[PDB]
Design a protein around this ligand. Structure first.
Ligand SMILES: [Zn+2]
Lengths: 79, 5
């Protein structure tokens, strides 16, 4: 039940991780960081600071909160 | 979006 990455607990540090986030992924760094996700610097691949859950292949129409919660129901952040 | 490990 532990926070997987406390260095990314800050929402501002998650936002700063989004250098070179690609245009095709459609979702914004603001929306993704607010749902607890930070950029791993590879493709559109993000990870949660809380559950360590990894998400990729983002599509227009996805919601960062909704994808995060539906795939990681154990996550305390989006619970 | 798709989870992965
Ligand atoms: Zn999570």
């Amino acid at each position: 039940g532990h926070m997987r990455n406390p260095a990314m607990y800050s929402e501002e540090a998650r936002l700063k991780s989004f250098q070179n986030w690609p245009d095709y992924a459609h979702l914004t760094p603001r929306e993704l960081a607010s749902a607890g996700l930070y950029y791993t610097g590879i493709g559109d691949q993000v990870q949660c600071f809380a559950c360590g859950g990894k998400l990729k292949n983002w599509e227009p129409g996805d919601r960062a909160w909704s994808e995060h919660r539906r795939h990681f129901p154990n996550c305390f952040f989006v619970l | 979006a798709x989870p992965f490990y």
